[PDB]
Amino acid sequence: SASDYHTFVSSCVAGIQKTTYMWREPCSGGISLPEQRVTIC
Amino acid sequence: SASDYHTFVSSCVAGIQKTTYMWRKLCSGGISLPEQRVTIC
Amino acid sequence: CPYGSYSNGSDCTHCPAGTEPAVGFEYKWWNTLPSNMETTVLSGINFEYKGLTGWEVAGDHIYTAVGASDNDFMILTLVVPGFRPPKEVARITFVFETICSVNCELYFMVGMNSRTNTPVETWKGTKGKQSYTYTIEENATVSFTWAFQRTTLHETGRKYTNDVAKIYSINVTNVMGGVASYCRPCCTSCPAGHYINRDSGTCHLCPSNTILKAHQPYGAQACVPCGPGTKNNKIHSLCYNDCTFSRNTPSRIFNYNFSALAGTVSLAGVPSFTSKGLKYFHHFTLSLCG
Ligand SMILES: *[C@@H]1O[C@H](CO)[C@@H](O)[C@H](O)[C@H]1NC(C)=O
Numbered sequence: 362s363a364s365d366y367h368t369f370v371s372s373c374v375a376g377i378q379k380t381t382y383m384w385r386e387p388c389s390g391g392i393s394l395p396e397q398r399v400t401i402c
Numbered sequence: 403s404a405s406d407y408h409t410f411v412s413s414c415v416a417g418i419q420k421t422t423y424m425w426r427k428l429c430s431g432g433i434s435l436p437e438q439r440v441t442i443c
Numbered sequence: 444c445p446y447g448s449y450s451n452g453s454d455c456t457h458c459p460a461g462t463e464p465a466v467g468f469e470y471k472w473w474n475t476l477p478s479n480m481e482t483t484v485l486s487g488i489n490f491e492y493k494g495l496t497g498w499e500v501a502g503d504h505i506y507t508a509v510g511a512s513d514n515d516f517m518i519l520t521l522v523v524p525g526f527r528p529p530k531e532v533a534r535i536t537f538v539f540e541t542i543c544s545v546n547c548e549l550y551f552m553v554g555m556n557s558r559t560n561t562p563v564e565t566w567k568g569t570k571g572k573q574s575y576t577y578t579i580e581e582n583a584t585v586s587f588t589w590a591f592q593r594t595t596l597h598e599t600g601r602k603y604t605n606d607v608a609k610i611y612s613i614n615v616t617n618v619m620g621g622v623a624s625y626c627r628p629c630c631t632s633c634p635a636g637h638y639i640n641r642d643s644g645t646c647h648l649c650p651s652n653t654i655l656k657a658h659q660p661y662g663a664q665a666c667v668p669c670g671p672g673t674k675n676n677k678i679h680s681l682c683y684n685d686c687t688f689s690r691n692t693p694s695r696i697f698n699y700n701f702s703a704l705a706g707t708v709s710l711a712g713v714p715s716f717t718s719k720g721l722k723y724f725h726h727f728t729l730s731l732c733g
Pocket residue numbers: 467468469536614615616624625658
């Protein structure tokens with residue numbers, strides 16, 4: 362499902378945050394790995 | 403070198419932090435994947 | 444009794460027009476030997492056709508008669524020219540009762556398309572009354588010969604006549620040029636997925652995800668719903684697997700996929716050596732779904 366990939370978002374410290382999602386080190390097919398995006402805090 | 407994994411250390415927010423260490427995996431050897439650590443900020 | 448009328452032995456009544464004309468063989472008694480079956484003796488010592496009377500009727504059951512020697516085969520050849528269709532071209536069912544003592548072989552053979560006889564099943568030793576059903580793959584000329592051997596070992600004289608094979612019940616289904624001992628209900632063939640019903644009076648469709656059996660025509664009783672994680676085929680002959688199984692779990696829904704598994708694979712067992720030098724290996728062709 363969608364909630365299967367591990368969430369590893371960085372929060373707003375020093376004005377920078379990173380939102381990157383990747384699968385667990387141990388899912389087949391499904392939606393591709395979402396890319397990271399940068400936004401001001 | 404061990405630190406060649408991508409570090410997703412959760413920046414201090416909501417009174418919680420995660421020292422998450424995850425492999426990027428062309429590397430070999432080195433210290434095994436270190437787990438996340440919890441401490442108040 | 445002419446075809447279209449069914450008798451049980453006391454009276455013959457005409458089959459109703461609502462039921463399809465079904466002709467089948469049933470010989471529960473043997474006061475008169477049916478014209479289809481003929482008897483012969485194959486002498487075991489010389490392996491030549493003796494031309495004697497292999498089996499003797501008794502009014503209720505037919506058993507094996509003693510020939511030149513007890514080792515001689517007691518053949519009883521029944522031949523049907525073709526099969527009248529209403530996998531079910533012929534479901535023949537037997538009632539074999541063997542009071543035989545030792546070295547008792549009932550070489551029930553079948554000749555598909557008048558080929559060389561191949562023994563489908565070979566009963567050995569004393570056995571009680573049981574029903575055996577055989578399936579014919581495709582329509583052709585088929586002969587059922589029940590070769591009997593009282594003794595495998597050869598001994599001079601007919602000292603073994605107690606070994607008798609009683610076959611008092613013969614049923615043959617979907618036969619050509621035969622009597623209509625029982626007429627099945629039906630009058631056109633309903634399209635695939637519709638169960639034939641005579642009480643309803645019209646072609647009625649089965650509920651979705653159900654497969655219909657042609658063995659029991661009347662009603663939807665033979666129409667059986669498919670199993671879990673399967674889909675019904677358009678022919679309703681057999682259930683189909685979508686190759687994608689979706690099951691529920693408290694965390695989320697699991698959707699296992701088997702799409703790439705539809706194609707066949709050639710995986711064989713390890714080379715196995717027989718008790719003697721000859722070797723073999725089982726090879727199984729698997730087609731999971733699709
Ligand atoms: C033989 O068995 C079948 C079972 O499907 C039955 O329908 C048929 O009536 C039987 N034969 C006779 C002569 O009753």
